Amino acid sequence: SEKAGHQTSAESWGTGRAVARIPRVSGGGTHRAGQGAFGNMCRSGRMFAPTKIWRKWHVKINQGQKRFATASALAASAVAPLLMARGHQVSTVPEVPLVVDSAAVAGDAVAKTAAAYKLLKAIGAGPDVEKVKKSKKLRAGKGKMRGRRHRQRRGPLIVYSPEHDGKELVKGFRNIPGVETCPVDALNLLQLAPGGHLGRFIVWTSAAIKQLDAVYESKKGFFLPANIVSQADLSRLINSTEIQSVLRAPKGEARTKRAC
């Protein structure tokens, strides 16, 4: 409150009295009379630098940066070590860019949540779903009285085509904990890299995969970035016959003998 700590009538007693030069509440029939006010050091006073609503809460990020980060997050989802490094139980599923038939996922059947649960165990996303269920527990701290009671792990992300799959996927899911749903036309880095960590387990549809090249072509003012290296395998680059034939003979070994 802008008036917090300022709704009092206080004046300094003076500079000759053997008391601190702090404004004191006038009066004479109360505990409050003669007590210090108007200070960050004082009880029922005004804290230093009162918080104001013009505090720049939102951050402006370039659209090219966002599309770079979203493209980097999609590439890490195709990497099976990065999925295990995040905490996803990816061991019983094949083809870690998971693609499911759109015909098996469109219609009123998958609109029921029992068939959505049956589909997840059939393709191999089962143990990730039970991982989220068994991880729900109460949150440490003051967030419980501020609306954030529990917290749990994240699960698989279902990516579909709204035109071809038919938008009834969201109702079939959305009660299985951890499982999120996202259209291919609007991909979210907050879902793709939860907590800033790359490699989320994503379940695609056949329609979403075919449409993924079209939605990155339609981004205006953006092309897929070119890497500053061509081959990231440093083992093949160092131990190639081109480098090694040029190399000068070693001066020493990994560990050297103590001379004196």
Partner RNA sequence: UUGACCUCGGAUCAGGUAGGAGGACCCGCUGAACUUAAGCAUAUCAAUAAGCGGAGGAAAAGAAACCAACAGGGAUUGCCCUAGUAACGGCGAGUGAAGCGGCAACAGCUCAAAUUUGAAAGCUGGCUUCGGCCCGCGUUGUAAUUUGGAGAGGAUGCUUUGGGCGAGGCUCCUUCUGAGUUCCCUGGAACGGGACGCCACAGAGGGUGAGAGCCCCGUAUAGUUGGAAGCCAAGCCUGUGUAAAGCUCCUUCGACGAGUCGAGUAGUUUGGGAAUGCUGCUCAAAAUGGGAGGUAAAUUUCUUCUAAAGCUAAAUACCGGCCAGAGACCGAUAGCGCACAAGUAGAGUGAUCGAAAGAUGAAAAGCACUUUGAAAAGAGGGUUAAAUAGCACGUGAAAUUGUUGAAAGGGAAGCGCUUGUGACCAGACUUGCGCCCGGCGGAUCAUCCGGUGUUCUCACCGGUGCACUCCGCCGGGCUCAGGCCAG
Partner RNA sequence: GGUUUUGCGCGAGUGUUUGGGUGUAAAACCCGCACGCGUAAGGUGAGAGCUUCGGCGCAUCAUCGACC
Partner RNA sequence: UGAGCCCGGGUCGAACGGCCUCUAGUGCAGAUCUUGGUGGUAGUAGCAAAUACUUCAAUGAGAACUUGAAGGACCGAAGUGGGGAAAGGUUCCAUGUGAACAGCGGUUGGACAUGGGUUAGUCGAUCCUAAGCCAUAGGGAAGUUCCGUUUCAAAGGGGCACU
Partner RNA sequence: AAACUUUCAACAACGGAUCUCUUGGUUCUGGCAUCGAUGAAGAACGCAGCGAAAUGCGAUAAGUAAUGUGAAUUGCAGAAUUCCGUGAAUCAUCGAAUCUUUGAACG
**From 70-78, 85-93, 143-151, 243-251, span contacting another protein (CB under 8 A):** 143-151
**Rounded to the nearest whole angstrom, what is the least distance from the CB of residue 253 to RNA in the complex?**
27
Residue type for 116, please? Answer: A
Please name which of 216, 217, 226, 178 lies closest in space to residue 70, comparing C-alpha atoms: 216
Residue 186 in contact with another protein, rule: CB under 8 A: no
Residue 221 in contact with RNA, rule: CB under 7 A: yes
| Residue choice 16, 28, 147, 196 for contact with another protein (CB under 8 A) | 147
Beta strands 10-12 and 23-25 are antiparallel
**Rounded to the nearest whole angstrom, what is the least distance from the CB of residue 257 to RNA in the complex?**
26
Please answer whether residues 24 and 35 qualify as being in contact, where contact means their C-beta atoms are separated by less than 8 angstroms: yes
Distance of CA 152 to the CA centre of its chain: 14
Burial class (CB in 10 A: 0-12, 13-18, 19+), 42: middle
Which listed option, RNA, another protein, none, makes contact with residue 65 (CB within 5 to 8 Å by class)?
RNA
**Rounded to the nearest whole angstrom, what is the least distance from the CB of residue 1 to another protein in the complex?**
11
Residue 49 in contact with another protein, rule: CB under 8 A: no
Cα separation, 115 vs 99, whole angstroms: 17
Which listed option, another protein, RNA, none, makes contact with residue 54 (CB within 5 to 8 Å by class)?
another protein
Q: Would you tell me which residues interact with another protein (CB under 8 A)?
A: 53-54, 145, 147, 149, 174, 218
